[PDB]
C-alpha cells in the first residue's frame, strides 16, 4: 500500500537504527507502525523525533497514558488527521477501557461524560489547537483547579503541541494508519 | 442515562403515534433509538420530521444507502455531532462493508481511498456544510461529471442539508446515541 506521498525507505537503504526500531516494533506488537516507515526517510531526524515523542507520550511522566491519549484524540479530531485519530483512538480505547467515551471524545468532548479534570483538559486542548494566539495565564486556572501540578501542565501543553505537529506531518505527507489499529481494544 | 437536556416523553404522556413508532423501532432493531425518545417531546412535529427523514435517508431513492451514509458521516464529522457520527457511522460500516473507509471518512475524506464520485460528493458536502454562502452553479459541475442525475443531485443536497439540521438539533439538546451503535458492523 501507499504509505506516503514521498519515497519510503526500504530494507536496503534504511538507516540501521530505523531498521532496529522496525525489528523492535515487530517483536513487541506484531507489526511495524506505518509512520515508522514513512517518516523515517530522513533517518537521524526521525530517530531524534521518536526519542522525544516516545518519552513525552508513551513513557512514564506527570500524566497518565489515558490523559495523554485523551489529549491526542481531541487534537487529532480537531485537525482531522486520520492516522493520529485511528491509532491514538485505539490507544485511548485500550488505556481507558471505555470505547463509548473514546468514540464520543473523538468527535466532541462536550458531548461525552467526562470528569471535571477531563473537561478542563479538553477545553484547554481545543483552545490551544484552534486559537493559539489567544492563550492567557487565566486559561491555566481550570487546570490548576483540577489538581494539575506545573510539571503536569507543562507535559500537557507539550502533548497538545506535539500532536498539533504530528497531525500536520501525517496529513501533509499522506500517512496511512495500520489496519490493526481499527480493530484494537474495540 | 440522560437522553436529553429537555423533558423526555414517558409511556403515559407520549403521543400515540410516537408510541406506535417506538413499537416499530423495538420490533425492527431490538431497541428504541434515543432520538425517538428525546425529540418526541413535540409529537406531531417529531412524526412529520420522521416521515421526511425516513423517506429521504433510509427509503428507496436516487442514491444508494452507502452514498447517503457517506454524506451523513462527512457532515456529522464536520459539525462534530456525536449522536449522528456514531449512528450513521454504524450505518456506513453496514452499507459499505469497509470499516477502514468509514473510519477514514469520519475524520477526513481526503485521507480515505475514495472513488472520483465519492470525492466529488464529499467535497461538495464539505463546502455546503462549512461555506454555504459561497455555493455557485459551477459547484454542481463535478457532481454531474460523476454521473449524478438532477434528481440524484437534489437528493444529495437534501441529505447534506438535512444532516446539517439534525446535527444542530442533537448537539443543542444533548442527545446521546444508543450503546448498540458502537458495536454494529464493527
Instruction: Please give the DSSP secondary-structure letter assigned to residue B58.
Output: I
- Cα-to-chain-centroid distance, residue B42: 20
What CATH number should be reported for the domain holding residue B23? 1.20.5.810
Q: State whether B182 and A100 contact (CB < 8 Å).
A: yes
Q: End-to-end distance of chain A based on CA atoms, in angstroms?
A: 24
How many CB atoms sit inside 10 A of residue A147's CB? 10
Same domain membership, residue B42 and residue B85 = no
- Position A44 in a domain: yes
Tell me, yes or no, whether A29 and A76 share the same domain.
no
Domain extent at residue B179:
62-186
To test the contact with chain A by mutation, choose from B82, B99, B110 the residue with the greatest count of A C-beta atoms within 10 A, namely B82
In chain A, the number of structural domains is 2
Residue B115: CB atoms within 10 A of its CB come to 9
Dump strand ranges (E) for A75-170: none
With CA atoms as reference, report the closest residue to A173 among A73, A71, A41, A74. Answer: A41
* Cell matching residue B149: 442525475
Q: Are residues B57 and B146 in the same domain?
A: no
Enter the C-alpha cell of residue B30.
431490538
- Residue B4 counted as domain residue: no
CA distance A113 to A116: 10
Listed by number, the residues of chain B in 44-103 with a beta carbon closer than 8 Å to a beta carbon of chain A are 76-77, 80-83, 85-86, 99-100, 103
State whether residue B105 is helix, strand or coil. helix
Number of H helices, E strands in chain B: 10, 0
A150 exposed, middle or buried (CB, 10 Å; 0-12, 13-18, 19+)? exposed
Per the CB < 8 A criterion, the answer to whether A42 and A16 are in contact is no
Rounded Cα distance between A23 and A39, Å, is 16
Residues of chain A contacting B75 with CB distance shorter than 8 Å: none
Q: Same domain, yes or no, for B36 and B80?
A: no
Q: Is residue A87 part of a domain?
A: yes
Give the number of other Cβ atoms within 10 Å of residue B59's Cβ: 9
Which residues in chain A are closer than 8 Å to B186, comparing Cβ atoms?
A: 183, 186
CB B58 within 8 A of CB B87: no
Q: Quote the crossing angle between the two packed helices B43-53 and B150-172, to the nearest 10°.
A: 140
Which residue stretches of chain A are H helix? 16-29, 34-38, 43-53, 65-79, 82-96, 99-107, 116-130, 140-145, 150-172, 179-183
Task: For residue A183, give the C-alpha cell.
Answer: 480493530
Domain-ending residue, one of B61, B77, B104? B61
Is residue B1 situated within a structural domain?
no
Which of A24, A46, A61 corresponds to the end of one domain? Answer: A61
DSSP state of A174: T
Which residue, B74, B42, B47, is CA-closest to B159? B74
The answer as to whether B91 is a domain residue is yes
Instruction: Give dist(CA B169, CA B83) in Å, integer.
Output: 10
| φ/ψ of residue B47, rounded to 5 | -70, -40
C-alpha cell belonging to residue A179? 489496519
Task: Judge whether A2 lies within some domain.
Answer: no
Instruction: Write the CA distances from B112 to A133, B107, B128, integer angstroms.
Output: 31, 9, 20
Cell of A115: 470528569
Instruction: Enter the C-alpha cell of residue B140.
Output: 454542481
Residues A15 and A83 in one domain: no
- Does residue A97 share a domain with residue A163? yes
Rounded distance between C-alpha atoms, residue B177 and residue B186, angstroms: 16
| CA–CA gap between residue B153 and residue B144 (Å, rounded) | 8
Structure resolution, Å: 2.3
Q: For residues B52 and B39, what is the distance between their CA atoms, to the nearest angstrom?
A: 14
Cell numbers 420490533: residue: B27
Neighbours of A108 (CB within 10 A): 19
**Domain check: are A38 and A96 in the same one?**
no
In whole angstroms, what is the distance from residue A154 CA to residue B83 CA?
Answer: 34
- Whether A50 and A89 share a structural domain: no
Question: Looking at the structure, do residues B75 and B25 belong to the same domain, yes or no?
Answer: no
Task: Spell out which residues of chain A touch residue B99, defining contact as CB-CB under 8 Å.
Answer: 182
Question: Are residues A33 and A73 part of one domain?
Answer: no
Cell of B42: 413535540
CA–CA distance, B113 with A36 (Å, rounded to integer): 21
Q: Where are the beta strands (DSSP E) in A31-183?
A: none
Is position B92 within any domain?
Answer: yes
Residues A55 and A71 occupy one common structural domain: no
Q: Please check whether residue B137 lies inside any domain of the structure.
A: yes
**Residue B186 DSSP class:** -
Contacts of residue B184, defined as CB under 8 A and 6 or more positions apart, other chains included, come to B90, B93, B94
CB contact under 8 A, B179 and A100: yes
Q: Are A105 and A114 in contact (CB under 8 A)?
A: yes
Boundary of a domain, candidates B61, B81, B103: B61
Chain interruptions in chain A, by residue before each (C–N > 2.5 Å): none
Q: Say if residue B67 is in the same domain as residue B110.
A: yes
Question: How many angstroms separate the CA atoms of B68 and B92, rounded?
Answer: 8
Amino acid at each position: 500500500p501507499r504509505l506516503s506521498f514521498l519515497a519510503v525507505p526500504t530494507e536496503d537503504n534504511a538507516h540501521e537504527g530505523v531498521k532496529k526500531l522496525w525489528s523492535k516494533a515487530e517483536a513487541n506488537m506484531g507489526f511495524v507502525p506505518n509512520v515508522f516507515r514513512a517518516q523515517a526517510l530522513n533517518g537521524e531526524q526521525f530517530l531524534a523525533w521518536w526519542n522525544y515523542f516516545n518519552l513525552l507520550v508513551n513513557k512514564e511522566g506527570g500524566l497518565s497514558n489515558a490523559e495523554r491519549e485523551l489529549l491526542a484524540v481531541v487534537v487529532s479530531g480537531l485537525n482531522r488527521c486520520v492516522y493520529c485519530a485511528v491509532s491514538h483512538g485505539a490507544a485511548l480505547r485500550e488505556f481507558s477501557g471505555d470505547a463509548v467515551k473514546a468514540d464520543a471524545v473523538a468527535v466532541n468532548w462536550r458531548q461525552a461524560e467526562l470528569s471535571e479534570r477531563e473537561q478542563a483538559m479538553c477545553a484547554y486542548a481545543e483552545k490551544l489547537t484552534l486559537r493559539p494566539a489567544e492563550m492567557t495565564e487565566a486559561d491555566l486556572a481550570p487546570l490548576r483547579a483540577a489538581g494539575l501540578s506545573d510539571e503536569a501542565i507543562l507535559e500537557a501543553v507539550q502533548v497538545i503541541a506535539m500532536f498539533n505537529m504530528t497531525n500536520r506531518v501525517s496529513s501533509a505527507l499522506g500517512f496511512v494508519p495500520n489496519p490493526e489499529y481499527h480493530i484494537q481494544s474495540r
